[PDB]
Design a protein around this nucleic acid. Structure first.
Ligand SMILES: [Mg+2]
Ligand SMILES: [Mg+2]
Ligand SMILES: [Mg+2]
Ligand SMILES: [Mg+2]
Ligand SMILES: [Mg+2]
Ligand SMILES: [Mg+2]
Ligand SMILES: [Mg+2]
Ligand SMILES: [Mg+2]
Ligand SMILES: [Mg+2]
Ligand SMILES: [Mg+2]
Ligand SMILES: [Mg+2]
Ligand SMILES: [Mg+2]
Ligand SMILES: [Mg+2]
Ligand SMILES: [Mg+2]
Ligand SMILES: [Mg+2]
Ligand SMILES: [Mg+2]
Ligand SMILES: [Mg+2]
Ligand SMILES: [Mg+2]
Ligand SMILES: [Mg+2]
Ligand SMILES: [Mg+2]
Ligand SMILES: [Mg+2]
Ligand SMILES: [Mg+2]
Ligand SMILES: [Mg+2]
Ligand SMILES: [Mg+2]
Ligand SMILES: [Mg+2]
Ligand SMILES: [Mg+2]
Ligand SMILES: [Mg+2]
Ligand SMILES: [Mg+2]
Ligand SMILES: [Mg+2]
Ligand SMILES: [Mg+2]
Ligand SMILES: [Mg+2]
Ligand SMILES: [Mg+2]
Ligand SMILES: [Mg+2]
Ligand SMILES: [Mg+2]
Ligand SMILES: [Mg+2]
Ligand SMILES: [Mg+2]
Ligand SMILES: [Mg+2]
Ligand SMILES: [Mg+2]
Ligand SMILES: [Mg+2]
Ligand SMILES: [Mg+2]
Ligand SMILES: [Mg+2]
Ligand SMILES: [Mg+2]
Ligand SMILES: [Mg+2]
Ligand SMILES: [Mg+2]
Ligand SMILES: [Mg+2]
Ligand SMILES: [Mg+2]
Ligand SMILES: [Mg+2]
Ligand SMILES: [Mg+2]
Ligand SMILES: [Mg+2]
Ligand SMILES: [Mg+2]
Ligand SMILES: [Mg+2]
Ligand SMILES: [Mg+2]
Ligand SMILES: [Mg+2]
Ligand SMILES: [Mg+2]
Ligand SMILES: [Mg+2]
Ligand SMILES: [Mg+2]
Ligand SMILES: [Mg+2]
Ligand SMILES: [Mg+2]
Ligand SMILES: [Mg+2]
Ligand SMILES: [Mg+2]
Ligand SMILES: [Mg+2]
Ligand SMILES: [Mg+2]
Ligand SMILES: [Mg+2]
Ligand SMILES: [Mg+2]
Ligand SMILES: [Mg+2]
Ligand SMILES: [Mg+2]
Ligand SMILES: [Mg+2]
Ligand SMILES: [Mg+2]
Ligand SMILES: [Mg+2]
Ligand SMILES: [Mg+2]
Ligand SMILES: [Mg+2]
Ligand SMILES: [Mg+2]
Ligand SMILES: [Mg+2]
Ligand SMILES: [Mg+2]
Ligand SMILES: [Mg+2]
Ligand SMILES: [Mg+2]
Ligand SMILES: [Mg+2]
Ligand SMILES: [Mg+2]
Ligand SMILES: [Mg+2]
Ligand SMILES: [Mg+2]
Ligand SMILES: [Mg+2]
Ligand SMILES: [Mg+2]
Ligand SMILES: [Mg+2]
Ligand SMILES: [Mg+2]
Ligand SMILES: [Mg+2]
Ligand SMILES: [Mg+2]
Ligand SMILES: [Mg+2]
Ligand SMILES: [Mg+2]
Ligand SMILES: [Mg+2]
Ligand SMILES: [Mg+2]
Ligand SMILES: [Mg+2]
Ligand SMILES: [Mg+2]
Ligand SMILES: [Mg+2]
Ligand SMILES: [Mg+2]
Ligand SMILES: [Mg+2]
Ligand SMILES: [Mg+2]
Ligand SMILES: [Mg+2]
Ligand SMILES: [Mg+2]
Ligand SMILES: [Mg+2]
Ligand SMILES: [Mg+2]
Ligand SMILES: [Mg+2]
Ligand SMILES: [Mg+2]
Ligand SMILES: [Mg+2]
Ligand SMILES: [Mg+2]
Ligand SMILES: [Mg+2]
Ligand SMILES: [Mg+2]
Ligand SMILES: [Mg+2]
Ligand SMILES: [Mg+2]
Ligand SMILES: [Mg+2]
Ligand SMILES: [Mg+2]
Ligand SMILES: [Mg+2]
Ligand SMILES: [Mg+2]
Ligand SMILES: [Mg+2]
Ligand SMILES: [Mg+2]
Ligand SMILES: [Mg+2]
Ligand SMILES: [Mg+2]
Ligand SMILES: [Mg+2]
Ligand SMILES: [Mg+2]
Ligand SMILES: [Mg+2]
Ligand SMILES: [Mg+2]
Ligand SMILES: [Mg+2]
Ligand SMILES: [Mg+2]
Ligand SMILES: [Mg+2]
Ligand SMILES: [Mg+2]
Ligand SMILES: [Mg+2]
Ligand SMILES: [Mg+2]
Ligand SMILES: [Mg+2]
Ligand SMILES: [Mg+2]
Ligand SMILES: [Mg+2]
Ligand SMILES: [Mg+2]
Ligand SMILES: [Mg+2]
Ligand SMILES: [Mg+2]
Ligand SMILES: [Mg+2]
Ligand SMILES: [Mg+2]
Ligand SMILES: [Mg+2]
Ligand SMILES: [Mg+2]
Ligand SMILES: [Mg+2]
Ligand SMILES: [Mg+2]
Ligand SMILES: [Mg+2]
Ligand SMILES: [Mg+2]
Ligand SMILES: [Mg+2]
Ligand SMILES: [Mg+2]
Ligand SMILES: [Mg+2]
Ligand SMILES: [Mg+2]
Ligand SMILES: [Mg+2]
Ligand SMILES: [Mg+2]
Ligand SMILES: [Mg+2]
Ligand SMILES: [Mg+2]
Ligand SMILES: [Mg+2]
Ligand SMILES: [Mg+2]
Ligand SMILES: [Mg+2]
Ligand SMILES: [Mg+2]
Ligand SMILES: [Mg+2]
Ligand SMILES: [Mg+2]
Ligand SMILES: [Mg+2]
Ligand SMILES: [Mg+2]
Ligand SMILES: [Mg+2]
Ligand SMILES: [Mg+2]
Ligand SMILES: [Mg+2]
Ligand SMILES: [Mg+2]
Ligand SMILES: [Mg+2]
Ligand SMILES: [Mg+2]
Ligand SMILES: [Mg+2]
Ligand SMILES: [Mg+2]
Ligand SMILES: [Mg+2]
Lengths: 272, 45
RNA sequence: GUGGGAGAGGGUGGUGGAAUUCCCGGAGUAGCGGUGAAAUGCGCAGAUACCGGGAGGAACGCCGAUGGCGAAGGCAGCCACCUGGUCCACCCGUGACGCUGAGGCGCGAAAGCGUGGGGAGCAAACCGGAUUAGAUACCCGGGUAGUCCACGCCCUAAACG
RNA sequence: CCGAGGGUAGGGCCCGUGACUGGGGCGAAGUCGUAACAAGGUAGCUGUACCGGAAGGUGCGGCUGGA
RNA sequence: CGCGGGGUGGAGCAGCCCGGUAGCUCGUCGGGCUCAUAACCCGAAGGUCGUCGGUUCAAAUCCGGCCCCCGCAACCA
RNA sequence: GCGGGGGGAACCUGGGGAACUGAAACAUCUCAGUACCCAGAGGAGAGGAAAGAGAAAUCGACUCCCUGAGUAGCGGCGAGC
RNA sequence: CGUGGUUCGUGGAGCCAUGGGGGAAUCUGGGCGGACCACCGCCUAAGGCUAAGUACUCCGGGUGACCGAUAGCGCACCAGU
RNA sequence: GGCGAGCUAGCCCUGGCCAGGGUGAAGCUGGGGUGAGACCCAGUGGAGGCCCGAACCGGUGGGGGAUGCAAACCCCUCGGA
RNA sequence: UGCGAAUGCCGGCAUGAGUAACGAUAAAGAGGGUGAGAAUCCCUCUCGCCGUAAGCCCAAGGGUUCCUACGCAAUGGUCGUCAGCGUAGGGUUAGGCGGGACCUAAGGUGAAGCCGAAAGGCGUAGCCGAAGGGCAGCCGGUUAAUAUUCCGGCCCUUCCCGCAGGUGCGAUGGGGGGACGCUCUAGGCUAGGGGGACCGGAGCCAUGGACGAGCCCGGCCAGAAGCGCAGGGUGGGAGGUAGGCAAAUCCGCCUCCCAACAAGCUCUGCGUGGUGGGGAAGCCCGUACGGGUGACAACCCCCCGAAGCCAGGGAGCCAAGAAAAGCCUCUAAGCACAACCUGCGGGAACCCGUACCGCAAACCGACACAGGUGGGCGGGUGCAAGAGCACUCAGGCGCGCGGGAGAACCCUCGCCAAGGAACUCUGCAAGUUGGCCCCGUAACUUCGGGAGAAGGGGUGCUCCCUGGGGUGAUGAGCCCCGGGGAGCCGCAGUGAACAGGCUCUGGCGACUGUUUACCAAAAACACAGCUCUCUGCGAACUCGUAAGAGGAGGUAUAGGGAGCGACGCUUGCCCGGUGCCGGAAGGUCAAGGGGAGGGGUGCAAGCCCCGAACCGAAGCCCCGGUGAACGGCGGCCGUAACUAUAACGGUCCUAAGGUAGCGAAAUUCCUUGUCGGGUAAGUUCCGACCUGCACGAAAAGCGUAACGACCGGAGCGCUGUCUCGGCGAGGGACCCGGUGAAAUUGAACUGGCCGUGAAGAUGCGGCCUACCCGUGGCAGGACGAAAAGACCCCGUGGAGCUUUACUGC
RNA sequence: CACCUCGAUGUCGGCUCGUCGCAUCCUGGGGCUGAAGAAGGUCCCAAGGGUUGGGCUGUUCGCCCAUUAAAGCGGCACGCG
């Protein structure tokens, strides 16, 4: 993985590019493609609600299958492994024997030419989606539903996975990529394997402009503002925080726990 | 050097135009005011 | 060559039990820990001791030896796959095809280093309690790198027979 | 044409010397402690690593040139 | 000059608020243990409280002055 | 089928509703239910025929003027209302 | 309970209104006379309409110890130009 | 209470532009090397917030201007390209 | 109801003043014309300027400025007979160009729906919305003024109707397609260009020579089908079928069978093509402008050659690169005497734009303003290349005051004896250097760099010989890249123009980048990268009362907040205080619950009111954790066998007493510390010492190659920076003619000194000096002008900002 | 000290241009000397003229280099924007 560069420019000395040898799709994408409305971090008022976004390459959205429980029993060949710009992971193209095509988010180890299937059936094998209740305790899995029929939510980022630690009633205990320990419903689908392209986290952006390609505009320290602008704005040189460290909106940014206390989901959580 | 006024006919009718004014309650009162004064033109040409 | 052996010899993947720690449940009360003796620490916010469940990492008790293997460093639960050396018998083949070896190349305990991961127990550094004239130690309570894995470095040693 | 050499520029090796600074050798009776030699009063040594006025201490592994 | 704190046995510090009898550690002295020193143990001595006035019955103590000390300040110019 | 819609100087009712200022500073208080914005009505609009007044065996819908009266009271018992 | 209206700024604070909670009765029922109780009175809430007396001045008219072209409306004049 | 992003700042959609030189990454190929490799050497290749420099975008230093040509300009010089 | 003041208001008219200025230093001269009047208008000649423009074409924007006749009050910076000006008349022609009776993008709007006191916000589909997609016209002639619009020639499109032939026809539904990046790029063309000894052509022989294979001018354009050349796109057949929200024979998917190729089929570019059309120099004609001839004009070879075309071409790369219609296919109801398809034929083909300016005198800049303004074309020669530089074509301009003079002084520019930074805050500025080819090239380094390091040599023209390419026949020609040899001239050969001065050594920042539009471009911001922290997804967080939305059609390898800021080596101790984190106990605690017990009133039943214990959240208290959380990290006294110093000790305090590294520093007050270095001499600078007023480890510590219009210090080179000035050029200044401002202004008949005076007198005193009035000059004074001091205070004036100020939200 | 000036009297240093004072740095003339000569010392007269070039610093000033007859001190809004 991880292409390096001789330093024939500054920032080429440190830059590091993804390895694309897993990818069979050359450029084009299957016309399960659809267009992406780039926000600029602006909401339906014209208002920036998320700072320092915008710019960056045009992208087509590849529509991807986060419920596998339509095609229950219908297998599919893995046609291609492709590049998807909207996610850390890679998408794998599936040709169903149905004749239908879907994109799956591509698991680690999954080969072009494999058969895949999803349902209460199905082997415990990489690619296969099952209700969680039927996945053997201990198997590591990705793309989990949190509640049944609602779509995969957990462990979709390149290299992530989750582990089945146990059963209790209609729920199973999972260990999320966060390390949190969560009861999830047994009925929820999941698909065995880790997500992979796990070398993803070692890319070294390497120069300013490469952050600009991903649509990340420069980020400015509160420390560098004036006090109109930020709790750290002010005061001659440099200067330390002068107060417990804050966000621009003034809440504390070291340690202050922000999850709502009375969330109903708390009955189903056990950890960090 | 580049000055403030850079006329473009679409922008103008899109902005101070008559239909523009009538959409917003704010703008209808501009018409109401301009009429009551006897402005020969309720709106830029 | 042929036929046979013994072996913690190496690499990869699996896998088992004991224990430690932490958590959950139970029962249960006034101390536990620790030492030369203590104190720090822990404990009525229910500790220790006891039982049930769970999680996680490391190391493999008896066998075990004054034993075996490897060139050396080293190598110890069990299973399979790949794989090195080695010895015995038969006396079949080649016909000196040998020894050694400056350079070269490769391997090389521990600690250390980089990038990830993993982190139970241990434990440099560090903190605290004792001791002492002092105690930057020895004993006690804590405790972070590290110890563990992958990849890549470092090349050292009472690397000793 | 070549040519002694002079000039101009840039390299290399060597010697001398330099505020200061690093250790080292030596020097009849200085100061601090006691690490080692006798379980040297914590067996000693050891590669390394961290720490500490100083000898050293501690960790990990090794040696017996110790019990 | 300004403001706040201080000055007490040989050293370093309490005591000063709140008037009446100066304490602590080290040091010093005499003894003990040791072959001896150090550690350790049993005894002891040592200060008029910077200085001069004042207040009171009584002043290290409360007040004033002078004297040294430590800290802070000296900006717009 | 019938209606609605939009406009109108000011005036009117209703929904909302400031500050400067005053208090010789300023928060309650004042400015003021003002300015203003919005809805609606009309030539007017509102209100109206007592579950009223309030000390007299009292008066009789509502509106408007005079008066009661700067009274009764209200009030960082201040400014002032 | 929370507020608004009233002269009433939490005051002894009723009355009228009502965002929230609980939540009746039909004359022997209910509301009110300034906390509350008695007595003695007043009135009949939770449906609706209702001229006139009132406000205004785009508009027409009549008057002025109103102006007379720097005044009087911003405009006496092809000015909201 | 309104009017403004025809200036300026950011973003969104959709187009356009960047003379000409220079340097020579990876890769590929070949050759060497090895037990196999790492690797080395060539040729090829044509990377880069890479170099020089117009257009274009700037605005570094100096001079001039200062009732200006100009309510920010002109000359020389200079940065990115 | 009386004005002299309010930097008053409105108007008028003065002063300054015939002063400054008349708007790029590209530049003018003369002859003729016209007219009342001519530097300024017209025409000729000559001269100068632009030429990747200062020429031409398009889009904005402007809106009659267009063409012409008559005209000069005003507008025009002068003049005006002219005009972008007055009056009047004329002038813009489209089925094919642009836009609309087509599509969708952001966004807007919005049946459904959702929210909101009202106003109104939101929102699926739909709809609107283009400089994107789709769509059929090319060449030439004509007008004073329009032309892909009129005309001429040659082509084409859609609707309607009919004929013929074909076929299950049929859609807003299903499917295909449309349909996509960046960089590099092949082959073949085309635009465009150069050359020709070949073809066509009026003429020309000057001034010494040339009647010549002389000079000069020109040698094309458009074109259906067909046909060539180059390219684009694309498999064909069968069987199965559960997917494409109905149904499909379509598409998808599995199987088999032939092609693997453009072979075919199709589509586009280019070439050729029936026909049509242009067609120079020169001479002549009166225009203000064009027209005749040249003429039956010629109309052809060679070469260069796109960034354009063939086009959806190819390759590589990561940052992964619109949509919908047109279009084709499939079927659906339906209809199959319909319908659709193909061909041909007749008809039918609407609205708006169309003048003119358009890098500017017509747009944005109050101006005929040296500013700003998107797209295309942009010729030739030379210089390595080029859109660069110089000169030039076509074409366009000499900038709407002029004439003279030849002072100071100013600006822009040229040169300079000897010296060479002595100048100065500083080499500021200006010099030097400068393009290409070759030789050559250090520390250090992250191995790329540093590097154009540095320092050098070459460079023109002539003749001779000779190598490789491209296109052509392997050939010549033409074109490209060279190699060797002998010579020639000058001061000089990148002969003009465009074109780095270099080195050593610190600080800061890693780097390219960003910024205070208009006094700061930096050491500030950003930046990859490191840490902490939050967030399990209807995520945290942000905007909104809400609905909604961003986050994100993302999911912990993700998202938010914060600090630090490549990289290297590192980042110590303190948890007492504050913050955050944990803690089911205990303490305190609001409403509420609870009512012991009390009260008002009533004859009483009762109504009414207080009300203790107790039970009651969060919060705080309390217990503990926490340092890339806010932050903090001692004092006095002694002590070594010279002295000094103090490894050592004592004692007070603390939550703990600053580790490594660094240190008179972007920090050091004393201070120009002391020593060393560089200098003849060094408050700066470099190195070092440590007595750090008052460094110190993610408001990071100490370093670091490379980078920098940053800031410091030193050398070489070279200089008008200077010793120290001089001369010269042009534009102003001066004079004459034309036009003619401004701030300012109590009035003026406005001298020096020494005094006096509200303390700095033209104005008062005393003396002295002094005929009236100007012009060019200098700036000492009128406490000169400008701006109701920006500092300072004052005001119970304001506003931005802060917090453990108060009070709220 | 707070008197003119806050409806503005621009502030250090440099440069340019000076002019004045004399408490004289030099040159001229003198007295005294603990003045042999030369060379000094000190004090008197004297303002005519003169009174250098560099290094360092923004500096005034000062220190230093090299010289000199000497390397004068003051004032003029710390002379002069
Ligand atoms: Mg909006
Ligand atoms: Mg971009
Ligand atoms: Mg930042
Ligand atoms: Mg700032
Ligand atoms: Mg703001
Ligand atoms: Mg703030
Ligand atoms: Mg701050
Ligand atoms: Mg500041
Ligand atoms: Mg600071
Ligand atoms: Mg700051
Ligand atoms: Mg978390
Ligand atoms: Mg304007
Ligand atoms: Mg437009
Ligand atoms: Mg616009
Ligand atoms: Mg009209
Ligand atoms: Mg074995
Ligand atoms: Mg044999
Ligand atoms: Mg090793
Ligand atoms: Mg190890
Ligand atoms: Mg652990
Ligand atoms: Mg300890
Ligand atoms: Mg101790
Ligand atoms: Mg332990
Ligand atoms: Mg070795
Ligand atoms: Mg020679
Ligand atoms: Mg020689
Ligand atoms: Mg030892
Ligand atoms: Mg010992
Ligand atoms: Mg010992
Ligand atoms: Mg020992
Ligand atoms: Mg040490
Ligand atoms: Mg230790
Ligand atoms: Mg060993
Ligand atoms: Mg003793
Ligand atoms: Mg006394
Ligand atoms: Mg201040
Ligand atoms: Mg109202
Ligand atoms: Mg107020
Ligand atoms: Mg007030
Ligand atoms: Mg007041
Ligand atoms: Mg006030
Ligand atoms: Mg009121
Ligand atoms: Mg009505
Ligand atoms: Mg009525
Ligand atoms: Mg009514
Ligand atoms: Mg009131
Ligand atoms: Mg009150
Ligand atoms: Mg009552
Ligand atoms: Mg009632
Ligand atoms: Mg009543
Ligand atoms: Mg009543
Ligand atoms: Mg009733
Ligand atoms: Mg009515
Ligand atoms: Mg009237
Ligand atoms: Mg008049
Ligand atoms: Mg008037
Ligand atoms: Mg009159
Ligand atoms: Mg008027
Ligand atoms: Mg904009
Ligand atoms: Mg261009
Ligand atoms: Mg390149
Ligand atoms: Mg570049
Ligand atoms: Mg450049
Ligand atoms: Mg400039
Ligand atoms: Mg005059
Ligand atoms: Mg004059
Ligand atoms: Mg003059
Ligand atoms: Mg003049
Ligand atoms: Mg002119
Ligand atoms: Mg001129
Ligand atoms: Mg040209
Ligand atoms: Mg137009
Ligand atoms: Mg105009
Ligand atoms: Mg006109
Ligand atoms: Mg005209
Ligand atoms: Mg005229
Ligand atoms: Mg005129
Ligand atoms: Mg006209
Ligand atoms: Mg036509
Ligand atoms: Mg449309
Ligand atoms: Mg809307
Ligand atoms: Mg369009
Ligand atoms: Mg178009
Ligand atoms: Mg068209
Ligand atoms: Mg034409
Ligand atoms: Mg059918
Ligand atoms: Mg052609
Ligand atoms: Mg002749
Ligand atoms: Mg030709
Ligand atoms: Mg002709
Ligand atoms: Mg392609
Ligand atoms: Mg449509
Ligand atoms: Mg036209
Ligand atoms: Mg242009
Ligand atoms: Mg023009
Ligand atoms: Mg002009
Ligand atoms: Mg212009
Ligand atoms: Mg103009
Ligand atoms: Mg621009
Ligand atoms: Mg431009
Ligand atoms: Mg060139
Ligand atoms: Mg040019
Ligand atoms: Mg000279
Ligand atoms: Mg020289
Ligand atoms: Mg310079
Ligand atoms: Mg060097
Ligand atoms: Mg060179
Ligand atoms: Mg020549
Ligand atoms: Mg050929
Ligand atoms: Mg040059
Ligand atoms: Mg250059
Ligand atoms: Mg420095
Ligand atoms: Mg920088
Ligand atoms: Mg750094
Ligand atoms: Mg650069
Ligand atoms: Mg910006
Ligand atoms: Mg900045
Ligand atoms: Mg600026
Ligand atoms: Mg500004
Ligand atoms: Mg810069
Ligand atoms: Mg600037
Ligand atoms: Mg870092
Ligand atoms: Mg909210
Ligand atoms: Mg959302
Ligand atoms: Mg989304
Ligand atoms: Mg920073
Ligand atoms: Mg730290
Ligand atoms: Mg420490
Ligand atoms: Mg703390
Ligand atoms: Mg704590
Ligand atoms: Mg704390
Ligand atoms: Mg409790
Ligand atoms: Mg209660
Ligand atoms: Mg509580
Ligand atoms: Mg605590
Ligand atoms: Mg410190
Ligand atoms: Mg220092
Ligand atoms: Mg120094
Ligand atoms: Mg400091
Ligand atoms: Mg200093
Ligand atoms: Mg010095
Ligand atoms: Mg230094
Ligand atoms: Mg820090
Ligand atoms: Mg540093
Ligand atoms: Mg810079
Ligand atoms: Mg830069
Ligand atoms: Mg000069
Ligand atoms: Mg001249
Ligand atoms: Mg006087
Ligand atoms: Mg007089
Ligand atoms: Mg008098
Ligand atoms: Mg003057
Ligand atoms: Mg004032
Ligand atoms: Mg105030
Ligand atoms: Mg005064
Ligand atoms: Mg003043
Ligand atoms: Mg003045
Ligand atoms: Mg004298
Ligand atoms: Mg003598
Ligand atoms: Mg004199
Ligand atoms: Mg200097
Ligand atoms: Mg000084
Ligand atoms: Mg003075
Ligand atoms: Mg002065
Ligand atoms: Mg000045």
């Amino acid at each position: 993985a991880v292409k390096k560069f001789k330093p024939y420019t500054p920032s080429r000395r440190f830059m590091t590019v993804a390895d694309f040898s897993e990818i069979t799709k050359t450029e084009p994408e299957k016309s399960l493609v659809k267009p992406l409305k780039k926000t600029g971090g602006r909401n339906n008022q014209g208002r920036i609600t998320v700072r320092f976004r915008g710019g960056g390459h045009k992208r087509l959205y590849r529509i991807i299958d986060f419920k596998r429980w339509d095609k229950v029993g219908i297998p599919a060949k893995v046609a291609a492994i492709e590049y998807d710009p909207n996610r850390s992971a890679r998408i794998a193209l599936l040709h169903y024997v149905d004749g239908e095509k879907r994109y799956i988010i591509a698991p680690d180890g999954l080969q072009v030419g494999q058969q895949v299937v999803a349902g209460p059936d199905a082997p415990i094998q990489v690619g296969n989606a099952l209700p969680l209740r039927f996945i053997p305790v201990g198997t590591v899995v990705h793309a989990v539903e949190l509640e049944p029929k609602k779509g995969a939510k957990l462990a979709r980022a390149a290299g992530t996975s989750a582990q089945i630690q146990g059963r209790e009633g209609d729920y199973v205990i999972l260990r999320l990529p966060s390390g949190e320990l969560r009861k999830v419903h047994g009925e929820c689908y999941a698909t065995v394997g880790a997500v992979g392209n796990a070398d993803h986290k070692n890319i070294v952006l390497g120069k300013a402009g490469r952050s600009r390609w991903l649509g990340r505009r420069p980020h400015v320290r509160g420390a560098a503002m004036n006090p109109v602008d930020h709790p750290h704005g002010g005061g001659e040189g440099r200067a330390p925080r002068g107060r417990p460290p804050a966000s621009p909106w003034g809440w504390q940014t070291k340690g202050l726990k922000t999850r709502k206390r009375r969330k109903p989901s708390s009955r189903f959580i056990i950890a960090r | 050097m580049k000055r403030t006024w850079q006329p473009n006919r679409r922008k103008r009718a899109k902005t101070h135009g008559f239909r523009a004014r009538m959409r917003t309650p704010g703008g209808r009162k501009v018409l109401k005011r301009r009429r009551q004064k006897g402005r020969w033109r309720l709106t830029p040409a």
